[PDB]
CSV table of C-alpha atoms and ligand atoms in Angstrom, one decimal:
chain,number,residue,atom,x,y,z
N,223,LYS,CA,9.8,-6.4,-8.6
N,224,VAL,CA,6.6,-8.4,-8.9
N,225,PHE,CA,6.3,-10.2,-5.5
N,226,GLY,CA,4.7,-13.5,-5.1
N,227,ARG,CA,1.6,-13.5,-2.8
N,228,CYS,CA,3.3,-15.4,0.1
N,229,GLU,CA,6.6,-13.6,-0.5
N,230,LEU,CA,4.9,-10.3,-0.1
N,231,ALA,CA,3.0,-11.5,3.0
N,232,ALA,CA,6.2,-12.4,4.6
N,233,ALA,CA,7.9,-9.2,3.8
N,234,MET,CA,4.9,-7.2,5.1
N,235,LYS,CA,5.0,-9.3,8.3
N,236,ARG,CA,8.7,-8.7,8.8
N,237,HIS,CA,8.1,-5.0,8.4
N,238,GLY,CA,5.4,-5.0,11.1
N,239,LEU,CA,2.1,-4.7,9.2
N,240,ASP,CA,0.2,-7.7,10.5
N,241,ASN,CA,-2.4,-6.2,13.0
N,242,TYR,CA,-1.0,-2.7,12.3
N,243,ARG,CA,-3.8,-0.3,13.5
N,244,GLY,CA,-5.7,-3.6,13.8
N,245,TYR,CA,-5.6,-4.7,10.2
N,246,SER,CA,-4.6,-8.3,9.8
N,247,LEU,CA,-1.9,-9.3,7.2
N,248,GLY,CA,-4.5,-10.6,4.8
N,249,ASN,CA,-6.0,-7.1,4.6
N,250,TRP,CA,-2.6,-5.7,3.5
N,251,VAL,CA,-2.1,-8.5,0.9
N,252,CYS,CA,-5.5,-8.2,-0.5
N,253,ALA,CA,-5.0,-4.4,-0.8
N,254,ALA,CA,-1.6,-4.9,-2.5
N,255,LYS,CA,-3.1,-7.4,-4.9
N,256,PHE,CA,-5.8,-5.0,-6.1
N,257,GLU,CA,-3.8,-1.8,-5.9
N,258,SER,CA,-0.7,-2.9,-7.8
N,259,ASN,CA,-1.0,-6.6,-8.6
N,260,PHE,CA,2.0,-7.0,-6.1
N,261,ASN,CA,4.2,-5.0,-8.5
N,262,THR,CA,6.5,-2.5,-6.7
N,263,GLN,CA,6.9,-0.5,-10.0
N,264,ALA,CA,3.1,0.1,-10.5
N,265,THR,CA,2.3,3.8,-11.2
N,266,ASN,CA,-1.2,5.2,-12.1
N,267,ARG,CA,-2.1,8.9,-12.9
N,268,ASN,CA,-5.1,10.2,-11.0
N,269,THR,CA,-7.7,12.6,-12.6
N,270,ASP,CA,-6.3,15.5,-10.4
N,271,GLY,CA,-2.8,15.1,-11.8
N,272,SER,CA,-1.3,13.4,-8.7
N,273,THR,CA,0.1,9.9,-9.3
N,274,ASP,CA,-0.1,6.7,-7.1
N,275,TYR,CA,3.1,4.8,-6.6
N,276,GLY,CA,4.2,1.3,-5.7
N,277,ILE,CA,2.8,-1.8,-4.2
N,278,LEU,CA,0.2,0.1,-2.2
N,279,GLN,CA,-0.4,2.9,-4.7
N,280,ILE,CA,0.6,5.8,-2.4
N,281,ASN,CA,-0.5,9.2,-3.7
N,282,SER,CA,1.7,12.1,-4.4
N,283,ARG,CA,-1.2,14.5,-3.4
N,284,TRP,CA,-0.3,13.9,0.2
N,285,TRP,CA,2.4,11.4,0.9
N,286,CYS,CA,5.5,11.7,-1.3
N,287,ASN,CA,7.1,14.2,-3.7
N,288,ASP,CA,7.3,13.5,-7.4
N,289,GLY,CA,7.8,17.2,-8.4
N,290,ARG,CA,4.9,17.3,-10.7
N,291,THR,CA,1.9,17.4,-8.2
N,292,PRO,CA,1.4,21.1,-7.7
N,293,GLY,CA,-0.4,21.9,-4.4
N,294,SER,CA,0.5,18.7,-2.7
N,295,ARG,CA,2.2,17.5,0.5
N,296,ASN,CA,4.9,15.0,1.1
N,297,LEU,CA,3.9,13.7,4.5
N,298,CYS,CA,6.1,10.7,4.4
N,299,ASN,CA,9.1,12.9,3.4
N,300,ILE,CA,10.2,10.8,0.5
N,301,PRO,CA,10.5,11.0,-3.2
N,302,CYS,CA,7.7,9.0,-4.8
N,303,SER,CA,10.4,7.0,-6.7
N,304,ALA,CA,11.5,5.4,-3.4
N,305,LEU,CA,8.1,3.8,-3.4
N,306,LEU,CA,8.9,1.8,-6.5
N,307,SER,CA,11.9,0.0,-5.1
N,308,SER,CA,12.2,-3.8,-4.9
N,309,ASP,CA,12.7,-3.2,-1.2
N,310,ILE,CA,9.3,-2.4,0.3
N,311,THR,CA,10.5,-0.6,3.5
N,312,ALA,CA,9.6,2.9,2.3
N,313,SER,CA,6.0,1.8,1.1
N,314,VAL,CA,5.5,0.0,4.4
N,315,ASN,CA,6.6,2.9,6.6
N,316,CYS,CA,4.5,5.3,4.7
N,317,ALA,CA,1.4,3.0,4.7
N,318,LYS,CA,1.8,3.0,8.5
N,319,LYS,CA,1.5,6.8,8.5
N,320,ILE,CA,-1.6,6.7,6.1
N,321,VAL,CA,-3.5,4.0,7.9
N,322,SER,CA,-3.0,6.0,11.1
N,323,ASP,CA,-4.5,9.3,9.9
N,324,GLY,CA,-8.2,8.7,10.7
N,325,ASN,CA,-9.8,6.6,7.9
N,326,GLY,CA,-7.8,3.4,8.6
N,327,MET,CA,-7.6,1.3,5.4
N,328,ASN,CA,-10.4,3.2,3.7
N,329,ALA,CA,-7.6,5.4,2.4
N,330,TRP,CA,-7.0,2.6,-0.1
N,331,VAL,CA,-10.1,2.8,-2.4
N,332,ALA,CA,-9.3,-0.8,-3.8
N,333,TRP,CA,-9.2,-2.2,-0.2
N,334,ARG,CA,-12.6,-0.6,0.6
N,335,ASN,CA,-14.3,-1.6,-2.7
N,336,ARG,CA,-12.6,-5.1,-3.2
N,337,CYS,CA,-11.4,-6.3,0.2
N,338,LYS,CA,-13.5,-4.7,2.9
N,339,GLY,CA,-16.2,-7.2,4.2
N,340,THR,CA,-14.6,-10.2,2.3
N,341,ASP,CA,-12.7,-13.3,3.4
N,342,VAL,CA,-9.2,-11.7,3.4
N,343,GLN,CA,-7.6,-14.6,5.4
N,344,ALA,CA,-7.6,-16.5,2.1
N,345,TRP,CA,-4.8,-14.1,0.9
N,346,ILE,CA,-2.4,-15.7,3.4
N,347,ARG,CA,-3.5,-19.3,3.0
N,348,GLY,CA,-0.6,-21.7,2.7
N,349,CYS,CA,2.1,-19.1,3.3
N,350,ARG,CA,4.8,-20.1,5.7
N,351,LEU,CA,4.8,-17.1,7.9
G,498,NA,NA1,3.4,15.6,-3.1
């Protein structure tokens, strides 16, 4: 599923991300925009052989099991395929664990390089939230 911008904002809100570890909703939207273009089916292979999955490009090196990332963890205890669902609960729940682990949203390289230090409130302009 390819979410609309406001549609995604409202689902992320409902799922408890706005101000999660202090990151406002527009941070999470901006990150989803640049990580996946708001597409829950987005996958991209990393150089190391791990793969990033879903709307927030969660990595099989640490967070989920895809059975082809040798020498990896599954810290969210989920198959990576659960991260591709049109229902974003699994992605959200896992993103909570990632953002809590010490580096905040710097864990998302697109957030750091494309959202951090920018006007992210724009990402939620005109959404009925
Ligand atoms: Na893994």
